[PDB]
Design a protein around this ligand. Structure first.
Ligand SMILES: Cc1cc2nc3c(=O)[nH]c(=O)nc-3n(C[C@H](O)[C@H](O)[C@H](O)COP(=O)(O)OP(=O)(O)OC[C@H]3O[C@@H](n4cnc5c(N)ncnc54)[C@H](O)[C@@H]3O)c2cc1C
Ligand SMILES: Cc1c(C(=O)O)cnn1-c1ccccc1
Length: 337
């Protein structure tokens, strides 16, 4: 590998937290993952796999081997007429991957445009946006099993995809994703449904609504709402949207008339966590070098040189303050290390 000893991780996590790793390693392919894995054992260290570090909260120096996935390769596997199965290596940067697909003439990823991170990490959290989740186009992946080292294929059912969840987040540290295969489409009628994405597409003339168009749109909305971690350290939205049983829903319902909620198919209501945190007077909060954004209340930030623990403590403060005022527990989205 390109091994580095006791070296900072500030340029490796979108929060910008400066903690040291006992060893840093960059994996270019599967041969590099194997040896990196025999090191972590042949030096008694635990192994921490990272991609772009945009779903990751670091709180202490990492007495691990940190293995940054930098595997590279973007390929069409199959071409059926209306569906195309593509495959990309784990370290491939996600958004350029999206551009690659649109370049090739394919739809399916367009609503996941400009999401940070790697292809390898995308199945971990089942990345979702603008009504689309990775499972909608997920076909299969290849993962290294860290109990015995044997590669196996995971079809879609086997991944137990959930809202910002998967078997790989349920069974953490077991599986190391190397490859991801998605089925993309051509010339499918356009997946858009009464939102700002549409409002702003149909203003452009909408001669034809190609995925490339909607992908151009979505970037623009992203570039206007979401804080860039290149200026304000963050890991995007910090809390998942909580969903409550119909009984919890009914009591909060007639306690706040606003209650931005969303009804699911199983009967229960998924509350807008942005509302909860904003109704809790948290928007624009700042204590020391951490806070929440002044617009998107879901985005916790490091204004400058914060610690992961401070971020972690603001998170916890918010969760209690919410739970102790509405009776809902906000779960986080990033993984804490
Ligand atoms: C500005 C910003 C905007 C965002 N917007 C969105 C959004 O719209 N929608 C959304 O869903 N998310 C969003 N995110 C968060 C999203 O989860 C991450 O950006 C991205 O999905 C994580 O990819 P990564 O390679 O950076 O993973 P990392 O942060 O590097 O890793 C996260 C977790 O995955 C594990 N992991 C990483 N690579 C592998 C691998 N190869 N095999 C196994 N486990 C692995 C790590 O160990 C860790 O547990 C946003 C984040 C930021 C900073
Ligand atoms: C959660 C979310 C959705 C969604 O729930 O579909 C669409 N965009 N985002 C988002 C919000 C803040 C930061 C990053 C992403």
């Amino acid at each position: 590998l390109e091994l580095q000893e006791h070296c900072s991780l500030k340029p490796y996590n979108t929060f910008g937290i400066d903690v040291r790793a006992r060893l840093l390693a960059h994996a270019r392919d599967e041969a590099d993952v194997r040896e990196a894995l025999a090191l972590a054992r042949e030096r008694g260290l635990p192994l921490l796999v990272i991609g772009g570090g945009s779903n990751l909260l670091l709180t202490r120096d990492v007495e691990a081997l940190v293995l940054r996935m930098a595997s590279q390769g973007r390929r069409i596997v199959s071409d059926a007429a209306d569906s195309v199965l593509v495959e990309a290596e784990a370290g491939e940067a996600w958004d350029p991957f999206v551009q690659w697909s649109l370049e090739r003439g394919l739809a399916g990823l367009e609503n996941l445009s400009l999401i940070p991170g790697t292809v390898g990490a995308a199945p971990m959290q089942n990345i979702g946006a603008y009504g689309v989740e990775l499972k909608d186009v997920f076909d299969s992946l290849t993962a290294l099993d860290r109990q015995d080292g044997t590669l196996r294929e995971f079809d879609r059912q086997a991944c137990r995809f959930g809202y910002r969840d998967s078997l790989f987040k349920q069974e953490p540290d077991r599986w190391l994703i190397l490859r991801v295969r998605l089925r993309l489409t051509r010339r499918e009628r356009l997946h858009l449904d009464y939102g700002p994405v549409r409002q702003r597409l149909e203003e452009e003339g909408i001669a034809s609504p190609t995925a490339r168009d909607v992908s151009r749109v979505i970037c623009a909305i992203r570039r206007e709402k979401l804080p860039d971690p290149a200026v304000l350290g963050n890991a995007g939205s910090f809390f998942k949207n909580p969903l409550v049983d119909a009984t919890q829903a009914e009591r909060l319902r007639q306690a706040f008339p606003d209650l931005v909620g969303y009804p699911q198919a199983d009967g229960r209501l998924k509350l807008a966590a942005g509302w909860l945190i904003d109704k809790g007077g948290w928007k624009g909060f700042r204590d020391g070098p951490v806070g929440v954004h002044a617009q998107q209340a879901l985005v916790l930030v490091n204004h400058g040189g914060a610690t992961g623990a401070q971020v972690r403590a603001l998170a916890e403060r918010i969760q209690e303050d919410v739970r102790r005022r509405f009776g809902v527990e906000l779960e986080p989205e990033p993984n804490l290390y």
